[PDB]
């Protein structure tokens, strides 16, 4: 019913510079007895969630001055200052004036230099070639910002549909991303064409990218 | 010291019914009402109801009145919340979390400092199955497929612990199969190849390891 937007969906901040993150609600979440009812969470990768602040402005035990949240009626705000790798992950706000609902949360991150994917092309294993299925494999590597785009092409044919990805989180020495991308034939579709292509656009490439093989 | 620990991970066919437990421990259990939340699988987080632990009434998101009940055990101090009818988009990590200050008759007003581990659930008709392993042969890149397993979770090492250095294990992906895919791999200096050994280590409870070598 309520509903809660965040904005921006992710962050990029520079080691050491303040980051803020907006949350609006579509009606007010001050209660007649005086309570504004806004929280806010982090989840750090892999980790539970845990409590940042709450009641718009109140920080819970351990939480460093670092962190500030502040606002009310529609309008909150919760400004980090001095950003470390170990502010990195997800902050959600959440309201409790009426039946509780979750923003959508913002991906905070360490904003580095652009840095260009070093792309890999794998060929599927003779060995799981026996049993009726072939998986090519494509990995991009060390890369940021996290934006990335794998087209894979089989006899320079477009493929769509038949592909899954899935990315790291960043790596919090290096402050990069990897991606990898797997195209699944069946041995016979696999066994009648010959080329098989990683076809790669990034923000860090001059023009796209690719990495091939014959088999 | 507060802690709120729960149970296991579970799996379920569709249609059928769960049960997370959450066992409480540090505080008077009765002072303090207990909350649930679910998290989808790289998506957001879902709040789901409240448990006063000593009247026992509850409050559900309109989306769980229908098949949600919680209950407790006071003398255990343990909260138990069970979800029936399930389908393949329950297929969450499903946390219990304890309200910051004493019952203050407004149960949903809750703010959750304490909160589980979390439990995965996984709603799904496959059947528990070991992956097959495969080699992604190759500054160069080699790798493990990790294919065709379920459920979630599997890990992955390299050289038994040894290599960590450049090591990325990625998020798995969940095929039309509905068995679960997932990579690892590393980069290594070219001039290793001829060099040294490459091994990933595959560990998938429940209940299977396999070790498998990176040549060429
Ligand atoms: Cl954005
Ligand atoms: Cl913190
Ligand atoms: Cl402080
Ligand atoms: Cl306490």
């Known amino acids: 019913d309520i509903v809660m937007t965040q904005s921006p969906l992710s962050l990029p901040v520079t080691p050491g510079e303040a980051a803020s993150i907006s949350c609006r609600s579509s009606?007010?979440?001050?209660?007649?007895?005086?309570?504004?009812?806004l929280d806010w969470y982090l989840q750090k990768p892999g980790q539970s969630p845990q409590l940042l602040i709450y009641l718009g402005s109140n920080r819970a035990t351990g939480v460093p001055h670092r962190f500030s949240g502040s606002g009310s009626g529609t309008e909150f705000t919760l400004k980090i200052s001095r950003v470390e790798a170990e502010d990195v992950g997800v902050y959600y706000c959440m309201q409790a004036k009426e039946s509780p609902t979750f923003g959508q949360g913002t991906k905070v991150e360490i904003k580095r230099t652009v840095a260009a994917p070093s792309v890999f092309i794998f060929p599927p294993s003779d060995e799981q070639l026996k049993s009726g299925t072939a998986s090519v494999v494509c990995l991009l590597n060390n890369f940021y910002p996290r934006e990335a785009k794998v087209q894979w092409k089989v006899d320079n044919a477009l493929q769509s549909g038949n592909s899954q990805e899935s990315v790291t989180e960043q790596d919090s020495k290096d402050s990069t991303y990897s991606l990898s991308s797997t195209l699944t034939l069946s041995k016979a579709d696999y066994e009648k064409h010959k080329v098989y292509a990683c076809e790669v656009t990034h923000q860090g490439l001059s023009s796209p990218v690719t990495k091939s093989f014959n088999r | 010291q507060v802690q709120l620990v729960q149970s296991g991970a579970e799996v379920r066919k569709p249609g059928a019914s769960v049960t997370v437990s959450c066992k409480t421990s540090?505080?008077?259990?009765?002072?303090?009402?207990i909350v649930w939340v679910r998290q989808a699988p790289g998506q957001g987080l879902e709040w789901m109801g409240v448990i006063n632990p000593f009247r026992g009434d509850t409050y559900f998101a309109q989306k769980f009145k229908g098949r949600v009940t919680l209950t407790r055990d006071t003398s255990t101090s343990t909260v138990f919340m069970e979800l029936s009818s399930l389908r393949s988009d329950d297929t969450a990590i499903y946390y219990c979390?304890?309200?910051?200050?004493?019952?203050?008759?407004?149960?949903?007003?809750?703010?959750?400092?304490?909160w589980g581990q979390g439990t995965l659930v996984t709603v799904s008709s496959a059947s528990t199955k070991g992956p097959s392993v495969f080699p992604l042969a190759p500054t160069a890149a080699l790798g493990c497929l990790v294919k065709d397993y379920f459920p979630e979770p599997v890990t992955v090492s390299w050289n038994s612990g040894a290599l960590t250095s450049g090591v990325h294990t990625f998020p798995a992906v969940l095929q039309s199969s509905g068995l679960y895919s997932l990579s690892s791999v590393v980069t290594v200096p070219s001039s290793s190849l001829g060099t040294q050994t490459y091994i990933c280590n595959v560990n998938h409870k429940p209940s299977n390891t396999k070790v498998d070598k990176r040549v060429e």
């Open positions: 009606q007010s979440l001050l209660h007649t007895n005086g309570f504004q009812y």
């Open positions: 979390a304890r309200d910051l200050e004493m019952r203050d008759g407004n149960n949903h007003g809750s703010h959750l400092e304490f």
């Open positions: 540090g505080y008077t259990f009765v002072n303090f009402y």
